[PDB]
Amino acid sequence: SGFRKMAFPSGKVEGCMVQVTCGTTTLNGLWLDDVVYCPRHVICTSEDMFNPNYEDLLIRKSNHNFLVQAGNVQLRVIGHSMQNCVLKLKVDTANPKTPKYKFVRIQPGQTFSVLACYNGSPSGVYQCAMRPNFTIKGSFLNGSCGSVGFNIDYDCVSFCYMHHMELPTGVHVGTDLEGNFYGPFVDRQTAQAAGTDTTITVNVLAWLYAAVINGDRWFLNRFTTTLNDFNLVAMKYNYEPLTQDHVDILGPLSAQTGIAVLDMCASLKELLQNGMNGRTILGSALLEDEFTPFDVVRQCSGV
Amino acid sequence: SGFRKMAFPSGKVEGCMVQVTCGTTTLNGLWLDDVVYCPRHVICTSEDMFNPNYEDLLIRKSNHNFLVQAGNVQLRVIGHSMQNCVLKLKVDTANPKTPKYKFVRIQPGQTFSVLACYNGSPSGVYQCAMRPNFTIKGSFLNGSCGSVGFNIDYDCVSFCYMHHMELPTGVHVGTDLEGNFYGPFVDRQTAQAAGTDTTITVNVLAWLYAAVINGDRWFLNRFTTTLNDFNLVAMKYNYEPLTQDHVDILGPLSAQTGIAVLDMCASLKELLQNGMNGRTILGSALLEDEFTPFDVVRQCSGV
């Protein structure tokens, strides 16, 4: 037993990270087949980033201006293109370590693993949720752009995130692997607002189920509620409204504990209105919402 | 910026995990050079585990009784030996993926990454601290034994932990890679007590420094303290006594924030005596102690 925030094993992605340098700017790229993907602001000087015209900037760059390095081994760039906010650098060698992979655009409330890299070398791996306001609470320093987020299903890597920027609030924003930003953000170093964030209700419920599956029961009570009655409370606490789809997704957990979903909603309601009284759930004194229902099943059954 | 619980990239270890089966018991082994390391209770039936005589049990096993499988590829076992609580299975093939590696015995209060595996296949990776009472707060199901804990320094993997057992309290115990248990534990499925756990004071201080480096400042105050005065408080709260060695290790953080270590101790003292008043530090409402000073430096400088 036990429950932890767990990242996917990163080996399949580690073999795809390379370094991309353009003039004095260096960040990471993702090498799949004969293409290297990287954020387009690699072509900016630290001064261009406050208001770049990426078209005019790219027009002064040729293939030999993109230095791509896999380990200590250099790659030869034979073409380049700009797709939305990423660059696609064509190289003359297919990555012999390319895994089976897909590009997917993840939905808010889903989770994924981030392999934080610098100079094309992995630094560490951690799990993130795509917030409802399309931000993530990451750990990113200068040079970390091009670090990617991913899920793994058996042997297939679904790439869903490439890192680009940190907002003034300390949260992090990026694109899918076709260069489209998650959320209302642009890759210009100017003040940008993510808007009100809300708690992922279905994930909090899954984590309360995970808590019961691991022996923390003090918050179960003799009450029940309705979808409509609970959502009047979710409103007051900037929680996502719960839906019947959410209820269905909690089915497997509702069946392994024997606790009806609306009964667990009744516990959550009391925790929202009364706090935790200095008690703790799975070693946390806050309500955690970065575990999907899928995440709890996977960990509580050894996938 | 940002601060997260981050595991090392797991690729170098993923290439060393194999499956080891003996009769009906299956767990994981670590394949390095021409040797596979695994917990010795792989030779037990589920009934033997409540009181095994490992010598008498091993005497009925030959090389061909140890089924070792790397992916879908079987390995040929040409010798076996029992060193303390692990088995060493000699195979006729050296792991072509063997990294540079060391076997180290970690100290209480240090951290390491766990690659949780089942059937020789990685499931996920997470960071753990070796508690002062020589337990860890992991995520382990049946079949996870043989999962290993490790650190990485550039290209060298320091293996420090192999998983064996879950105590009745829900915490997890294991050995170093020479088969010696961390703590007062034996590999028999009987009730065993880890004893009082205590909070890793030096790690809490490092995480408060990490909080300042990331903009959480509300807990800084106008007070200071002495090593002796603080440790009279640490006592009351089952905190590890702070030492001058601890003070030195916090030097780099004490120099990047400009906050004297005894001043930060004064903040911790007030947080212990007064709680957090429903406030939060790096998104947690508890005092976190599973980050070493080394861990904070590494993450706040991109190693």
Ligand SMILES: *[C@H](O)[C@H](C[C@@H]1CCNC1=O)NC(=O)[C@H](CC(C)C)NC(=O)OCc1ccccc1
């Ligand atoms: C790419 O490596 C980098 C990631 C930032 C740097 C610190 N933490 C991050 O997540 N991105 C940028 O430098 C980005 C470039 C634009 C053209 C999109 N601008 C940015 O993030 O500016 C805000 C900022 C910069 C430096 C420190 C903190 C915030």
Ligand SMILES: *[C@H](O)[C@H](C[C@@H]1CCNC1=O)NC(=O)[C@H](CC(C)C)NC(=O)OCc1ccccc1
């Ligand atoms: C090895 O795969 C396994 C790991 C346990 C199983 C559940 N969570 C863990 O960490 N170890 C054992 O089964 C171990 C065998 C002895 C000979 C050391 N006994 C054990 O951990 O028993 C306690 C226990 C068993 C099953 C569920 C929960 C606790």
